[PDB]
Assembly symmetry: D2
Homo-oligomer: 451 residues x 4
């Protein structure tokens, strides 16, 4: 209830006239213009407040209104605004060292701005690495259907969500896909000996059938998040890594969403006992206060780029990547996550959120499955629990809308896989409290009563 | 003390060698320069050496270093709202989009991205989807010039005409075509001819006809090919290319990543050439590179095609960080600075002075083939022979770049663009550069030229 | 003429080595066999050695060698009209098209090509143009099975799932997808499951969903994967795949290049499996390989889409030699032979006898993993271990192939199809083969098996 | 002979069952060939036509050759099939004979069609480099307005968009350059070849794409189907020298120009070059039976002789090198040689060219008349000054008028949009002076319409 009422009309009119909004139907009258935020709550220009159950876009991990983060950026901006990453600056050096600690070592870090750029960089490094190790023929990249890895032509090629690809094709050749592990739609795969699991055998078979010698890397999120919070058997990622190694290919762990405490570990891959050859990161690295991403590469791979030959080094320049202010802010963000025990709070609040959700709506006739790890949770809505038929779009959409009216931002896997945008997503900021979790669940439960 | 400074430097260099992967350079850990601080046109490393940055970082620190008002703008926004998804909106993005539309001359709708490469990728996707929704799904092809650069991603590398930026990252997608670049130095007299009799202008029309008009989505070009060597076209070239695009039903995308925001002596490069582009891409100088931000400006009529109620009719593209609140608020202040300090006109005037003085000072040098530029954007083409125009040996131009750096000038070079044509020195100093600093640039270069 | 004949053969072999490039083999001039003459199921080389041809040349001499009536048919036509372009027509092409339509069961329109690879290429182009003219230009994708083969050209190799036929000829075009091949030996009990619960059947539907139905033009498959290893599917597999194509709006192409013309005990392989394919491709046995000819049969509803007055509406494709008059006239006589000598039914009955006798004869051999087939089309899968099904060592299966040839039997092998899986012996004898010649085949193989 | 009722039935069967290449669905317009002799063909209704196109640039020795029929028949009675993984005597003898014809020293891979022959050349080029330490060389370069086949890869290499449209997308790695055309680029034939812009373009594009990524440049010596587009004399040699400079191969597409068509055994022989790879089809058998060949320099073949798993050419073409077609081809080459057909092509071709200029050269819509050997293009224009291609109906009416009057003349239809304006003649090499008079007389009268 602001003392002076903000002038919305001009701002709203200007947005509609000049701003192109990603991922949505033209509905200017539905635009939410964010004004301010604190903790887990955001507020629009009209003054309405919402619990942000999505951390913006899976990314505001340390929460909103962090004065410490603002100061870190401010101090750096006053010292040195820019230095090219062909050369170096102290914030980038300190962050690279810090990321190496977080990763468990030993990696060399190339800085980029976005998760899409980080994945593109991983592809180029993989190809040049093999060209310089006497295996020029290895160019192929393999991923899972229903996955996402970016918004560029090559990361869309690697993406398995056709609703993100359609009408932007044709793409380059050399991108292959396999069935995604999903313990809900493939019941009992979790029980099986991992190497008897069909979608695990598929990885090995396709690599054999494509010829090992042509495969550069397998890319995967530890959990398929955007796609629907699809989860694999415990030994899946390790089996995939052993398969890559068998065929001489690299494993790239896409940690763009799972990174920085999201799943209850520093990174998603750490749930699954693997050391990936390349790790890509963005989003939570700065809690999205400033743009920054990174591609961490095993050091043996970096060694291949040290020669005196004309084309032996990485011939790639990213103007803004590794921005000084973003790096300084990221260092402070990592210190916050560590000092406030946000990784373990994610694990614990995540369990509570999962346990409570099942208790509150699990019996609902259109709730097919509730699953998650850390503060990363999917509620799969179905027309029928027996057949697992995805719920009608109209029904899930009305639940997301109802929650917003009531002050809760909840996500949905819209525009990922046709006929399967049936999944509600929660990824709240890691600082979320037990009481705010009660608000989330209470709000959702009430919204569920409309279907 | 120096001894302490030496120790800190070593510790830092050691950490860098161990942990940091540097773009665009041979692995030379000892040679690395760690930036420490900066003010105006000068940067300083951790050991305390100062350099005139004749490159504005990477063609991008247009308003100069040390801008406290830019730091304040970002800080004030970070304290108000640090993040909001661009699927939704926030005031800094809205105000910047409106401001950019003024700068562009209207009427455009702006999609925000982090980098120039992302901005170009966005342009490609918008061009393809626009045609798909206008009844022409078959239009997928993108056309650009050899010796051009448009980004570091698979698709922007496919559109790129610098093979040294592409080699060993192929194969790329099909549907990317290239034509001869206009270069008034290596194609003497093209500037004089009627534009439509110019062979590389006829090439654009011919190739569109021979590929079938109906398959061409867009032609992408920088108004000046900058990274490639500051290659410059006849005055009427860009307008003839636009008219040719329109004839074939294709869009023209002006890549303003480097030429934007006063660099050429106009707000944008295309404004030198009397054309209104369908799409404009921007990055770099938009924030003077203090924070990452880029934009893809699209004509209103193209945007209208994405307003339908159909399932796939909207732009199904999400960029997490693009349009960052702090970067937008900082960009707004940056544009205010450029306007209030008359930096666009200073670029034009200091640019002329730099060009005229360079010619007087080193024009007669036997290995200087050509000096050209527009605004604070200048290339000095070095040759073994002025008659044949044979590019100078790599060692010779490299020694000049290194000699300047020792003498405290950072000058650029078109390294790793086109094989055997790495022979062009580049200057793009910050638009605040003074007459006296220009004298330092030229004096230092002149002295470094004496070693070859 | 003891040394005169030797001089002649030596000379011929020397000229082969210097001038002839052979398909699909390591350079082995001594190894080369020069065919001289043939009759029935037996071929004879220039040195005078005779062999039972257990492979019908290359799966193709279905009616057997030495057919004077086929020679006469070609000769009579060469004397009447040697050539006429298929943009226009000739009577042999018209009569053959009509006869192929009967054999197919109607109602199809036939486009003539020389090879199976060309026939499949033609099918791809027709599928794409069909959808472009049906208001779905976005449909470009082609789907097939890993371990499958569809030709030796860039696009048919892209559709091919045998990497040893592809390696070092890449990169290929995008838009070619592959799924797991049904193989009732390595996936035991899929033949007794409900077809829609079979994982590699569900895979077809899932991948079409995940790629977006609207982008899929066609699924291409042989009814039995022949060159690959005689891999066989559950009875209802092909019908399920067709229903899945129809569900997604895509076409089904039956690759009948090897299975066609009696090979499997039906006129065509798809007829074992109760489907009416949208497109059928044929070559090989159509002329018993006496002359080159192939065909792409397309459903009439599909051909209707190419009858418009629009500029690009017709099939803009010309194949100079395809539908050669002599080859068509010979093919007609060949079809008449197959029908009059009841070669289809004979293939089915002789094929059963061959399969059962092989099981009785070498079934218990410790390295014989599986014996399977349908009609005169049989695979013997050799393994190091019957429990693990590990493919046998290459040197071991190679020695069996060589031992057989030395004793006058040509037996095939799935060499250079799938790495690590080159372990399957293949028999496809001419459909005229007799009980007694089958005894010779099996007896010779049994004796060759002894040595491993 | 065949009563109207029976011909109607045959025509009806064609409509129902036969899919024709390269034409609008016009069942009534279909010509069903019945028989032929020399340069004349006859349809089922009994009408006769001078075939000014040799079928499709291919019936080089003429129709009605009993000796060719006998050669095929004799072989079909001896051995009808043997796999080219192995060998037969007709293939061996032909390979040797083709090597003589080419000038040596080449190794021959047999295919059926020109499209397959070109595909084979692409695969060999790529594997050759992969085995020579340059796996990065995968690109193929060709000219816009050129044609190399009807398959996805040969269409990618093709520069005629009307043969490509709606069959796309194609694979990446196919590049195109401006075609030399001495009519639309006047005075390039007088320039020093290396100052010619479309010659410089080859060198520049190879540099700009990076030499190390280029596998081969493919080109017809004369762009025939595209509209008989002809280059300066030193163009092909300059292109070869440029390929060599960049470490790339030159493939001469001789599918149409081969076997006497241009007045030499092969087109490249007009231009003083020895190509790395030569592809052939059409006239090799005079189109009596299907056969094509890919001739590869000996030194390229040497790279495929190793003991490594993947070192040999892993390519099988079932029908390629058919015994009857090879035996017939051998007799066809003996005929061309014995009857002095290559020389006749040059002589009759010169005659045809000069008489045409005299008869129709002054026609206001005839922009240019050009050719070499029995390969001639007459470019029709709305205006001789601007060279604007003639209206489409106008050239179509001339083609139709000629057929009505018993002459089959060709046209470059469905090649380059807006540029379908060139009439083509490629008559059988045995054509006589008197038949040439008939051709020209018939065309002259047809031109009267427009
Ligand atoms: Cl600064
Ligand atoms: Cl994934
Ligand atoms: Cl905030
Ligand atoms: Cl450009
Ligand atoms: Cl198959
Ligand atoms: Cl004839
Ligand atoms: Cl025979
Ligand atoms: Cl050509």
């Amino acid at each position: 209830n602001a003392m002076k009422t903000k002038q919305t009309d001009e701002l709203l009119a200007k947005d509609e006239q000049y701003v192109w909004h990603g991922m949505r139907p033209f509905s200017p009258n539905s635009t939410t213009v964010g004004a301010k935020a604190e903790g887990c709550w955001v507020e629009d220009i009209q003054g309405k407040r919402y619990l942000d159950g999505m951390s913006g876009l899976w990314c505001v991990n340390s929460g909103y209104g962090r004065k410490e983060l603002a100061e870190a950026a401010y101090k750096q901006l006053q010292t040195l605004s820019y230095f090219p990453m062909s050369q170096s600056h102290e914030p980038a050096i300190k962050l690279a060292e810090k990321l190496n600690e977080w990763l468990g070592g030993e990696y060399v870090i190339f800085f980029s701005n976005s998760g899409s750029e980080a994945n593109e960089t991983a592809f180029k490094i993989a190809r040049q690495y093999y060209a310089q190790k006497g295996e020029p023929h290895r160019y192929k990249f393999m991923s899972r259907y229903r996955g996402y890895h970016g918004n560029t032509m090559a990361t869309m090629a690697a993406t398995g969500q056709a609703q993100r690809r359609y009408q932007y094709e044709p793409f380059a050749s050399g991108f292959l896909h396999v069935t995604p592990p999903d313990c809900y739609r493939m019941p009992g795969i979790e029980r099986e000996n991992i190497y008897d699991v069909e979608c695990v055998k598929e990885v090995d078979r396709v690599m054999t059938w494509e010829l090992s010698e042509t495969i550069a890397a397998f890319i995967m999120e530890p959990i398929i998040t955007g796609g629907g919070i699809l989860m694999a058997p415990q030994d899946y990622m390790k089996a995939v890594h052993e398969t890559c190694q068998k065929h001489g290919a690299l494993l790239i762990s896409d940690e763009v969403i799972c990174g920085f405490g999201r799943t209850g570990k520093a990174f998603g891959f750490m749930n699954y006992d693997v050391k990936p050859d390349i790790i890509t990161m963005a989003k939570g690295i700065t809690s999205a206060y400033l743009p920054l991403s990174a591609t961490a590469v095993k050091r043996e791979i970096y060694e291949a780029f040290k020669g005196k030959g004309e084309y032996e080094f990485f011939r790639h320049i990213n103007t803004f990547g590794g921005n000084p202010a973003a790096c300084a802010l990221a260092l402070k963000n990592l210190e916050i996550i560590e000092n406030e025990n946000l990784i373990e709070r994610s694990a614990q609040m995540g369990s509570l959120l999962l346990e409570q959700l099942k208790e509150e709506i699990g019996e609902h006739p259109l709730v097919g499955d509730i699953r998650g790890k850390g503060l990363l949770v999917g509620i799969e809505l179905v027309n029928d629990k027996e057949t697992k038929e995805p719920i009608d779009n109209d029904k899930i959409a009305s639940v997301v809308n109802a929650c917003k009216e009531k002050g809760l931002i909840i996500g949905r896997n819209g525009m990922t896989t046709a006929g399967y945008n049936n999944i509600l997503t929660l990824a709240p900021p890691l600082v979320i409290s037990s009481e705010e979790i009660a608000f989330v669940i209470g709000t959702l439960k009430t919204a569920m009563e409309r279907i």
